[PDB]
Symmetry: D2
Subunit: 451 residues, 4 copies
């Protein structure tokens, strides 16, 4: 160990650690979860520190030689070379002060290995506060997770569902309402519904981006911008947009709202919770369709990871959706509980919304590639059941009457025969209608209004 210091005095730190006294106090203050910042959060903090140093350089506030050392150390952090140098718990001071200092101290220690002396606060934290930096890094990470990762994953799941919709366009089967047999549909129509739910999900994520991408940077301690250049925010956002290509990043509409609240994360979590609700419906329908092989619905076979495969990716999708619903409740609870100039639930809210992005992204790709793409339908079986259902006798009423239609339905179920065969067996052809009329009235694919 080695001795390091802060406005509170002297602290023993691991001899080899790149962090300093404030990070070490945080390590001892918050042994709560045993988990620290994720890769995406560290990347975002590195991106922001490099952008701040660039702007401080461009305004002549920071010596070119200091700004270059910060930019080089922050690039190393952003690329993942120092992840083991971020040991602070998620459950830390609610501004994320502790992780901001962690980034500053690590950058100063990297710079010192290259013979440049940087102060963690005076130079690395120049024109910045914890109050504006940790929420900015959080919104960068969330905007990147939405745009670069979740929307493409959802687009892959949409396309896999839409491909099934087309492949199964004529795969007629009984409709089910209240779990009870109903008039015919096609598997393709049901898959077109699932596809729409995922396309609407993408629309919900895109709708939240104008507020999710709002950055607090430039507001400093309380939103007033004191101790920062009047244009710090716009210059830093411009640098981040050029480095990331995330045109969704923008300066906050109101600098006070951007620090006093995290309502953009709450809004975005609502979109993710809606996607979780959609995925639960899609996954539950698929596992029920694949149920059996004898005593279940036996409509489709899921690919193995026969018709005896356990629906393991529907189970992973429904467990992920439950987690997103829980995370969403935690996010809203933190979002509501800000006071005055600062919401002090940022580390917990960041943990939850970034996890929800990650789980939905990863499970959506797995579901698309390793379940949806490989589903096979019991086509002839589905059609036979549709042709054997009491639900399709209604179009006979005007020819044979209500009472005889009911007797046809009862006999078809009892003898396990089609409606067409039961109408013929009861001797109804000729007096009431012809074979041509029967085949028109009982065409289950036409009843599904597909071609």
């Amino acid at each position: 160990y080695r001795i390091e210091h802060d406005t509170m005095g002297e602290v023993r730190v691991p001899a080899k650690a790149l962090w300093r006294a404030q990070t070490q106090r945080a390590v001892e203050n918050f042994p709560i979860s045993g988990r620290g910042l994720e890769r995406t959060q560290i990347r975002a903090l590195g991106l922001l520190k490099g952008a701040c140093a660039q702007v401080n350089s461009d305004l002549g506030l920071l010596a070119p030689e200091k700004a270059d050392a910060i930019i080089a150390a922050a690039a190393e952090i952003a690329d993942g070379q120092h992840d083991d140098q971020f040991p602070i718990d998620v459950f830390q001071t609610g501004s994320g002060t502790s992780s901001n200092m962690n980034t500053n101290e690590v950058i100063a220690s990297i710079a010192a290995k290259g013979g440049v002396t940087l102060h963690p606060n005076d130079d690395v934290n120049m024109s910045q506060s914890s109050n504006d930096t940790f929420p900015t890094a959080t919104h960068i990470a969330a905007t990147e997770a939405a745009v670069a990762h979740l929307i493409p994953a959802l687009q892959q799941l949409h396309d896999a569902l839409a491909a099934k919709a087309l492949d199964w366009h004529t795969v007629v089967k009984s409709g089910r309402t209240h779990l009870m047999d109903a008039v015919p549909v096609t598997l393709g129509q049901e898959f077109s519904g699932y596809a729409r739910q995922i396309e609407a999900g993408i629309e919900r994520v895109r709708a939240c981006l104008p507020r999710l991408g709002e950055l607090a940077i430039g507001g400093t301690a309380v939103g007033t911008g004191l101790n920062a250049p009047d244009d710090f925010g716009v210059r830093v956002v411009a640098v981040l947009v050029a480095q990331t290509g995330l045109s969704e990043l923008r300066t906050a509409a109101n600098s006070f709202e951007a620090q006093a609240a995290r309502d953009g994360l709450v809004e975005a979590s609502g979109a993710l919770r809606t996607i979780a609700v959609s995925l639960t419906k899609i996954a539950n329908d698929i596992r029920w369709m694949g149920s059996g092989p004898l005593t279940g619905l036996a409509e489709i076979q899921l690919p193995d990871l026969p018709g005896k495969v356990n629906p393991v990716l529907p189970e992973a999708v429904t467990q992920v959706a439950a987690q997103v619903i829980g995370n969403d409740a935690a996010i809203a609870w933190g979002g509501a509980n800000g006071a005055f100039e600062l919401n002090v639930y940022i580390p917990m809210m960041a943990r939850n919304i970034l996890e929800s992005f990650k789980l939905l992204t990863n499970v959506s790709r797995l579901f698309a590639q390793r379940c949806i793409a490989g589903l096979t339908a019991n086509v002839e079986h589905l059609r036979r059941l549709a042709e054997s259902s009491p639900s399709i006798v209604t179009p006979l009423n005007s020819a044979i009457g209500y009472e005889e239609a009911a007797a046809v339905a009862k006999q078809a179920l009892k003898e396990r025969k089609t409606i067409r065969q039961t109408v013929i067996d009861r001797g109804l052809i000729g007096d009431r209608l012809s074979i041509e009329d029967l085949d028109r009235r009982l065409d289950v694919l036409a009843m599904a209004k597909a071609e």
Copy 2:
């Protein structure tokens, strides 16, 4: 106390009741909450039945005499004349078929008084099913609630907050972070933040309208449109848009999605929940600002309705209810199966209540709390003059290094920056008292 005849027996119905046997059976089946449809839901069922009869008449499927009687009866229901004729519990068959049949039977009874015989199913339910009607009426009610009621109420609250942000632009006070003393802000700056939260709320509601306004009508039992005209949904939506003025109403993008799921209600509830989160922070700050007046912050005075912050308490209680209703909505939303989501009556109750509560409490908060707030300007300035100061605004006068030495000694000796500058003998040609006092001015430090 009349008697009616039904397939499994005789049904006893109150005499002034316009509902018939199916509704009476549902009354006996579901004695669960003792609460039925709200006025907004009844209105939407009447609007939908009038529009369907208008379209069936236009397509020549329904005789003009019968269509005119349904249209006139449906206009009375939509105008709130029959809010006592819908006795069925909210906790009913999950398609809302019971309430659909309730509407059909009340229209048939109204028409019989004007001397026309309508069959509840074959005439009033023509081209409709037991499954595309109640979700359509729900989305009509929810879209009307959002566009005609909630957004204007939020705009009233935004405008009241923004008016305070301007009045109090220069009312300097201490900033608080972590509940601890921080650098100065103005009361107007804080109110500008509240106003932005409500403006963003209006943006959040507007963003959900493309999906909230999707109607299932025309998809019939399973979404295929079997037993409806091919253009039923588009024609009914046009009639509803023309009669309501709600341009946000639209046909569903996908008729299967629109019946298998109620994702548009889950999305909209998310927007309402975000507004509840915003309102909680605004209401909590206002009650804390009004706290005391000896033991608290005593920053503002709330209008009296020692004043208890009763409208902040109503707002925070409403926000808790919207958070709970939002969890019920999502639970129902997730649990659809195959062609139909059977949680619609419960989802409808919860989202329509969340819209009503937010609309009503926002207008009350705006008119009876925000508009009448008074700032304790002298107290607030005394708090600003007790905030921490910084040395930066002295840099040009004493240089980076003396400033850093003022900062160090102020921290070590627990002194203000001002007193530390004086005690270090720095008042001279480089820095007068005037220049010290102008550089450290608390309203200047707030950067208004």
Copy 3:
């Protein structure tokens, strides 16, 4: 349309209204939900005001003619004769002070009709504050809801599920795990599980009562009991227990915890939420078992209210969703108390009391009109169990796992029993007798029922 004069001007009160000026101001201040107190709330406020007057009379603080007039008026409220005289929104001042004043005013007006002048504050609110009354009434209502109504309704459901468990003791059927076919169970064993879930639900409600029944009465404004007799709480609780028979009512263990927090409501909501979770699983299994009549599981038929929609499982799952939502609202109000008072009580009271009511009513309906009348497709269930690949494992020791796999594949392809498939493949002989085959494929023995 009669007129009344307040401390702040003129107020019009409906003519047949028994409330007075302070209630009418609250009607004007809080037009939010359009829903006021439920009947259980109103009853409890009446019970509490009767007991307080009884105690104030016993201690010589209140003239007996006034106490008798309050006691008779509060009894009419407790009996549900004045449920239309409580017009204040649920979304009111968060102590419930407005509904407290509503009760005081209605009692004074009832007494006035009998010739007795009561001051709503000085007489009807004597020894009480604006902060210990409404939460006491809420805990009286919730405790009565739990003991008198929800536990008996859950016991009815338990007894119905248990009756079916016994009736279906030998009704063998395929088991399902992950929705896939598994080794045999009986419908009776599955119903015994549902019954246990409801019996555990009753245990959960019973376990919260020590804290649900704690009353704040006697704590006054901040919990110190200032301006009330030192023994007011134990006296009033004793009167409530003697009059109602609700032995679970008790004074609070800590008078400050009893007003600063509503943690007993949050605790009880958690028990109701667990019951909602259990009922969701029971109702979802029952509607799936009744799915069909052709393309579904077709294990059982639900009674009409093979083609009946499962309307009472839909009512039960909708109620469960409501109870989940209500539970989130309760916890949110619970967490947000400050210092000496939690000011979310009206909202918490609405949610907890609704959850009790919905679970009570739907549990009795589900027991009587769904569970009691279920019918099993007994021979169909046994045939499927006897035709499942899941039951070939007991053949392995006689014919080998490779030939057992061949039997399973052919039985499924030809829609035949495993037994018929073994005979059709000519496996009966010295390696396996017909009696040995019947013993190995005894699906009811595989279910291991009592």
Copy 4:
């Protein structure tokens, strides 16, 4: 690296890995969260497999050389020696069968290093199925977390709050209702309330243990106990209780309920959620009481734990109350995910177990750790601003009521108005209006305005 062979082909496994082909397939199948089982779950799986080997050896079903090798390997897992050998995602097959197989394979690999050959399924999984094991380990872990860790951590916080209640027995201050000035209380009475909340929290956790401690072991695939000895569950429970001292572990009341549902976890999460609600109120009151030091309430001072800002150098923040309120928010989220999974079981099996286990065990860990830190690093070192608190109580309009019987309610209200206008004590305002006369001596005023007596401290 080192290759292996599965029923579906050839699997590459890391060289130092003790897991085998099935675990490697599960690693490839579920790259979802990148987080696997926690040490408490790994320990419970080890405890369970050792107990099962003990019982199978006792019934004569498993050869003693094989049982001893399983017991020795299972004790290494339960002792935390192999926490890097469980790489499968939380978000796996919903029975937890993948993690069950992980345990079997790791035990077989540990046994191989000692020259004993164990079949992961036929030996390490003997009398067990893919469905009664993981929920049993979950309930063992949750019961151990409740009894051995959470209840003691909550007792430490209770004792710290109760010690402050005693120290501040006479520290009078104004009460606050609706955030407005109220009649007097003592800081000790308020802390007595906080202590009761935590004591009630312990009562809520004990009240769930009769059902949290119920184990599914013995029920096999569907709860019937097919392919297990009839008394397997009681035998394994007897061994676990004897070895761990966890008296709360029991065989399920109904073997179907214990596999079809995870209602015991939903119940337990409700207790943890109630504790989170109580902790939120306590932590929020404490940070408000410590607010300022010049623009807030300044009722107490919290011990300084780290620099709070560089822009405002001496500013120190209520970081432990913030950690507590963030933990509480996490527990309320976790609680909603647990109830969602609990509700969604079907027929003989609830297939949300790995997700419910992650959430319930994290809630226990966060509450345990943050309770201890809050007791030791915040509550124990609080100091009260006694003279500030008393000054405000003695200046409160709320204390004029006891003057009514001497000078009348109208004159008392006049004293209140003047005192609040002129920033004086009530006592001084009474003197400054010349009311000391025939119905009120100076000692009689001091008796009526005794603010500590008005608080009515026991």
